[model samples]
Target chain A: AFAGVLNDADIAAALEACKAADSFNHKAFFAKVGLTSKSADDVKKAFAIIDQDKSGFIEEDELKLFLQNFKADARALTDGETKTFLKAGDSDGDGKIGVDEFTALVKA
Target chain B: AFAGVLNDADIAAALEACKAADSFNHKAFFAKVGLTSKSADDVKKAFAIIDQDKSGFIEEDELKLFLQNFKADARALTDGETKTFLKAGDSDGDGKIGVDEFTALVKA
Candidate 1:
């Protein structure tokens, strides 16, 4: 798994590990991933980088590779973790995360 | 005007001063007003304080006294400045600002 090129299954497993963690400090996680102490413009730049596909929304696939986008050496999010993260930011319930939603999630 | 109890006219004049400034660094303003380097929860607390009227939204009148809410000695926003602030956060175009909108304004 540490060979660098992660498959879908490998990513899913990592996400599950995230979900099972004792306590996930979202604030600390965001800060560690470089989302805290940033201006709106900087946060928007982060969103653009993480969006990957340029589809204007962060769908499940992009989110699965979430951690890696922030730091190349980081692991992919697990299945459960991906879904939780999605729900946290999908405020409009559109099944996708828009820029505003993404911004709120990071700032929050 | 320096007597402490600021009247509507005094606040309005101060707001004009803000708008007329050669450069209004929103980023610096937000930082100096204590909106920077704070977590989502802390930002929400700031929103509650600025909302003032307890109406779940920060309306024009509240915005007029916006600075004072953050710092008692601070001056109020001018009519033009108040309108500008309201527009910045009124994403929904509902003529008032919700908690989410307020959060975005400060974080942005």
Candidate 2:
């Protein structure tokens, strides 16, 4: 259910989201650009941090944060992305996230 | 004549070389990661600065000088760049620069 054209603003916003996820101490993964993960299980701990809503999943609202950061001057959306984003965060088969979806994100 | 593998190391070195070119600038163009180019057609004068060898075109050997700063592992001949290791000073296209290659790098 999540798909769109990605550009610099989108990519930058996604990276910014990654950074924000790392800020919360309870569940953070400080990933550097070149680092390869060693512990697969620890990633779920990271997902717990990314799912800011605590609604058992990540959603469109959470993704909006990225769009706001990498904003373009255009009032209209670029490349058909409209206001939607979060391809990296949406892992579940469902239209949105749930605990398993978040947990699976890290483990996978 | 230029089909090259752009690995992380190569990218890192290329950036370093560009840095060296910036340092010697009788002319320098400070650029950031996201800046889009706005100017066009400013060359000849700047080329006069980069053409250290006085040559008109740049060559691979000139690029080696960039690696002069880096200590490539041990056995690797980092410069003359049979094996490239960006030293950060390869601005011109002379096998080794004289003037045009060295001086004109800025204009190009």
Candidate 3:
């Protein structure tokens, strides 16, 4: 789901749920901002969901499908949007997002 | 403009609006994410609305105003929510969010 209204308290409680302590880990930091943080291992394990070929990278089609998979009403990214999206994290500018870059962006 | 329904095409168009045929700037990325990117002068010009007391930082109520002011139906952030929101980028953890942090978060 889109996760409800997301008022501050909801966001706060979600942040607190992962860890009781005031300090947050890398994942916790992502949680605070409404992104569900997946540990590096978890991300690696679940990478197949987006990386269909298990080729360690997500190309254009896989990327679009992965994004649209988030919701029933989600729309696919146009060619330009896809390119811009890829550029957002295609750190090496290799025209492809490797597993490492993919996970960091998800956590980001 | 709630910027229209923001279908992928709209998003792509918006992305193209700022800079065509290429990479997006820091503000442009935020724009793709549904945030309006403000220039340094623009941010400083508008900071007063949130930093009501002219303090160097944005505390609880100020943040509520900052978030809610965006849309007419926006709700306030609860106290704890405010803290979590602040902590999301309050790098120094001084309780309140300084201008640098505020701009970064907005651009983020």
Candidate 4:
């Protein structure tokens, strides 16, 4: 992952996940964690845990849960942050994350 | 997940994941695995594994590899099956996946 740079690998990965699954909820998920592009084992695990259903996807409630109750992290994510995160990630203009879009963030 | 019935839970989950990401690739990803609904713990893990680049999505080549050699699955997914799966999931008619569109199939 890079800072303000596109990692083709990450974008590719995000797109694959989106297309592989049956559905996705990009907004609520990113709302939990503000938008950033730095992949780490912890971030990945956090993603997995936040994806409560383990459906290879995340949704609003799960994101909300992470923001409100996900461990000892600061209440760093605010409503504005959530909205900004969603807007930033909704690349396809569909108001949601597809596979590629999802990956785009992690690599950013 | 049910047989040919939209699991509201699954659909909701799917949409959440999609909306959370920045991009998606519906056609390429599903071309790997034929469509089916019953969610399993292992299926989730399997998805993670195939999602090279670890961006949470599966791409076409990755899928093709799976279709070709994801163990002894028998080249069960033909090119026709891949095309059919993509057509079934590409709900927005963008020839790709949105968050909700992706979840629609896994819950099918």
Candidate 5:
């Protein structure tokens, strides 16, 4: 009767809805993407997966293509979108998001 | 009747036991200290408490006095103990343990 997990289409729709909104609501975005239900360990695994180069940090370049990491055919984030996302997550102002920063961003 | 949570004495005893052991087992240490049952958010709270100066990172001096943060009357970690502990958690090798590193150390 119902799917157990979010499918690619679900994620894609959520991304579009969030992006089209005036202001980014991270909590709603995370919930829509199904990350709200994930545990801290699960969030860390997600960070590792998105960290692509294994550099232990998510830099601007990786952030630009953030959505594609969730779905293979997903559109990449616009420069403005990427900048806003990075600013929201980069608490320490170190020019990149650390694992802790990423985790806090998701959990928030 | 039984106590629901670990008291300072229990934490002190666990610390002494782990210190006396030949090799420091972080997992065992965290379990004995009651961190094993905590959620990621709880772990982050613990890290913030320990960071003390709100620097967002735990440095050597903070780490050396780590035990006292958990239990006020507890003895500070020895230089050798602190060095080993720092080495274990400083994944980025930046000479300090960030929030993510601290969470991973406790959860490990």
Candidate 6:
């Protein structure tokens, strides 16, 4: 937790609690408690895995990788709003989110 | 808390904890639970509040404004580590973080 260094470990945990529909950007959240990292490659890789088939996008069906990872319903449906947010977070609106961008988002 | 969109108030509270040495962006902290804001001018205002004397840099004194607002130490601290992290979070590294950049960091 780095207790004193990142007094907001709880905050980072909070972001971890978010469903896939959430932004992975933990910079602001971590910054709240004095945490900052400049890399987001790991999260981006997670995104790649979720976007299997390399469609450069993860439609509702393409999210199974995440659902599987998060232990949620593999078929859990994401409404339209979530889909839009997904694209927005994907930057370049590529319909897919990569780990670099994902990590960048967290560091952002 | 929005209990959904931004259901993570505790995270926000944590981000608020980072002192003068803290990064101004509260991104991942807010996203921890599912909060997103399209504009951060108000958020930017909050950042501006901490950078007193408008010197584009916040020394221990500049932090006073935030402390008084947070009911914490206003003229009490700033470690070197915090100062470097501050610059790193600036992304643009202009020694100053504009609200838009702040917003982008949060929304990133």
Q: Give the number of the best model, judged by lDDT.
A: 5
Worst 10 residues of 6 chain A by lDDT: A19-28
Q: List the candidate numbers ranked by TM-score, top first.
A: 5, 1, 3, 6, 2, 4
lDDT of model 2 at residue B44? 41
Report the C-alpha displacement of residue B14, candidate 3, in angstroms: 18
lDDT of 1: 0.61
Q: Could you give candidate 2's per-residue lDDT for residues B1-108 as a string of tens digits?
A: 001312345434333323321111111111211111212232343333333365663344434343232223312223423322122224432234433334333233
Ranked by lDDT from best down, the candidates are 5, 1, 3, 6, 4, 2
Scanning candidate 5 chain A in windows of ten residues, the lowest lDDT window is: A18-27
Q: At residue A28, give the lDDT of candidate 1.
A: 32
lDDT of 3 by residue, B6-45 (tens): 2445355333322211211223323443444557666554
Model 1, range A1-107, lDDT digits (tens) per residue?
21233245444433332332221223335543345566888778778877889999999998878767634666666675577678878999988899999888878
lDDT (Cα, tens digit) per residue for candidate 6, span A69-103: 33333224245434633654577666655555455
User: Best candidate per TM-score, number?
Assistant: 5
Q: Is the docking of candidate 4 incorrect, acceptable, medium or high quality?
A: incorrect
Q: Candidate 3 regions off by >4 Å?
A: A1-35, A71-73, B1-68, B71-108
User: Which CAPRI level is candidate 5?
Assistant: incorrect
What does candidate 6 score on TM?
A: 0.33
Q: In candidate 3 chain B, what residue range of length 10 has the lowest lDDT sum?
A: B17-26
**Clash pairs detected, candidate 3:** none
Against the true chain A, what TM-score does chain A of candidate 3 give? Answer: 0.57
Most accurate candidate by DockQ: 6
lDDT of 2 by residue, A1-108 (tens): 011222444344333323321111101112211112424454444444545666766555553432232244312223212122234335544556565555443333
Candidate 4 local Cα displacement, residue B29, angstroms = 41
- In candidate 5, which residue pairs clash? none
Model 4 misplacement above 4 A? A1-46, A67-76, B1-108
State TM-scores per candidate. 0.39, 0.30, 0.37, 0.26, 0.44, 0.33
Output the worst ten-in-a-row residue range by lDDT, candidate 1 chain B: B16-25
Query: How well is each residue in A4-96 modelled by candidate 5, as lDDT tens digits?
Result: 344555576455543432223344456667775788887888788778798999999998777667666656766766786798799999989
Error of 6 at B66 (Å): 7.0
Docking class of 6: incorrect
